[PDB]
Design a protein around this ligand. Structure first.
Ligand SMILES: CC(=O)N1CCN(Cc2cccc(-c3cc4c(N[C@H](c5ccc6c(c5)S(=O)(=O)CCC6)C(C)C)ncnc4[nH]3)c2)CC1
Length: 167
């Protein structure tokens, strides 16, 4: 299905919309929804907490079972788990948190995880309280992702700065 609408195409493979990723996931029910995860898959705030709350904590129960069996992910790494009622699959991706001293080179590695899936609904990796320059995160996305990615950015002011810089 992947019925994305209202998206502005920036490149042959990158689209963007001023929207809440949770609301987009409920409407579209995409094949893959990307979560802006941490290495222990603990979804307490921001995007991760919003996606987990939309699943009524089912994402957290499943995440805890994955960590118990496989251990933590690494910064720049990912894992595929159920999307529950939001998507067929959830691709949990760990972008570097520069506000806590993690290296920005790892942002490229985090975006490279998107390439194993044909179509993804995703947030701007490492933006918000993760501390990275959001326009720089968009540049890395454009230069790294080669499959089709629909970026949901829930802030019209940020969306307008991204569309203006990209033009
Ligand atoms: C109608 C109603 O009451 N609502 C509204 C609330 N809605 C649920 C709801 C509640 C709370 C938050 C969010 C939401 C935040 C968010 C989003 N934020 C962006 C962003 C990008 C990357 C990262 C972060 C943030 S972070 O979380 O700071 C750190 C990780 C990396 C910023 C605009 C830069 N981008 C996309 N979708 C979103 N969703 C949503 C349920 C439905």
């Amino acid at each position: 299905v992947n019925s994305f609408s209202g998206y502005l195409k920036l490149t042959d493979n990158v689209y963007i919309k001023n929207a809440d990723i949770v609301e987009e996931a409920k409407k579209v029910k995409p094949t893959v929804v990307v979560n802006a995860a941490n290495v222990y898959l603990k979804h307490g705030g921001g995007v991760a907490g919003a996606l987990n709350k939309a699943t009524n904590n089912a994402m957290q129960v499943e995440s805890d079972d994955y960590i118990a069996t496989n251990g933590p992910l690494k910064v720049g790494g990912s894992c595929v788990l159920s999307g529950h009622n939001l998507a067929k699959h959830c691709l949990h991706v760990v972008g570097p948190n520069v506000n806590k001293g993690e290296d920005i080179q790892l942002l490229k590695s985090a975006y490279e995880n998107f390439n194993q899936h044909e179509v993804l609904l995703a947030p701007l990796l490492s933006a918000g309280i993760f501390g990275a320059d959001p326009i720089h995160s968009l540049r890395v996305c454009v230069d790294t992702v080669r499959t089709n990615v629909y970026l949901a950015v829930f802030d019209k002011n940020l969306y307008d700065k991204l569309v203006s810089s990209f033009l």
